[PDB]
Symmetry: C3
Subunit: 137 residues, 3 copies
Amino acid sequence: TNYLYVFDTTNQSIAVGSSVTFNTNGPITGTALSHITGTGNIIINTLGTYVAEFQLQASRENQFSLELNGTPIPGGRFGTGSPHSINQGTAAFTVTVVPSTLTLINNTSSAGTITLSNSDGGSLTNVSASISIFQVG
Amino acid sequence: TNYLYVFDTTNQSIAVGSSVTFNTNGPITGTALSHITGTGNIIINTLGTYVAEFQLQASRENQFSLELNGTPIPGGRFGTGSPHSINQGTAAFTVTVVPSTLTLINNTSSAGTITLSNSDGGSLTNVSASISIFQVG
Amino acid sequence: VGLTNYLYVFDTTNQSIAVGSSVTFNTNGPITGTALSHITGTGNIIINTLGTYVAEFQLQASRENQFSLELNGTPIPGGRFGTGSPHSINQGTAAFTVTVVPSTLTLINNTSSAGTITLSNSDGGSLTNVSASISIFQVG
């Protein structure tokens, strides 16, 4: 079955309207999902239903939405109201044209530009942002 | 494959013992799982094992459990100790009678009734609560 | 027809976790298939089928903390997660490939600055919460 994991380990900055980049690829199965390391783009090449999860650790309160083909997905936006705490969201979407593109967009954090942290809680390097996604139809 | 995504976008209030309602259906596939918009009832019509995940953003610390037919699911209860911080949990469970109902119940938050926040961290509307569930066996 | 491998384990205690130690889970949830096993009271998820697994963990501690998923004693790439807020969930979803069997998945205090971490089974409410948990399934 189709599965993809991507994550970032950097203190990248994301401005309103831009996407989270992922510098590393985890395990990828199947051929429906792909992703070029260093980009925020996740290419989807099979119609049907997908379930995506996102985690993002920033130094400020933030608001981020999953976006499909540049448009926010219904139920795809999550925010945190506490600094230095996780922003996490799981949501499903239907791909009706291929290739589609899934991104994670700074959908208007109040603070404006958001800077991620790969250092929270410990002295070792964290995943600062990640998406885990699989097809369910 | 049986999958369901429902989510809410409101600042609803939830009393101790009441369920979180979901105003919006995301993708649902299969015959096992369903939900009527506006309710907090996810109805499960096929026996087997299910993996449910919930997310909830509230204006203060809270405690919620997934319940099945009115009974807390073992491992279905999660709390957070920070206002405007996400209460997220993932729990698997077995359905031995059908149809059965899955709810997300205020159970039992210290502050009493819990009001959600659909506006944390940004200027657009967030998912204030949601469930992602699929059948594994 | 239904050979999905799936396991859910969770803990309901205020366990103390020294730097380098693993989160233990006192309770087994549903387990399907043959690949995955866990002896309660341990933090060891044993994996006896080669392939690719997705592991999600949740952890509720009284201080900010940094934990990593580890396989056979080595931190998994993309498996380390930290939060900067006390009494705030540490939540991470990562996927890894098991290249030898048996392999042991653990979740380890991979050096929170505060040192020994103590979980909370009581945040938010008057009932007992899941203070730590892992849900894992096989995708490849």
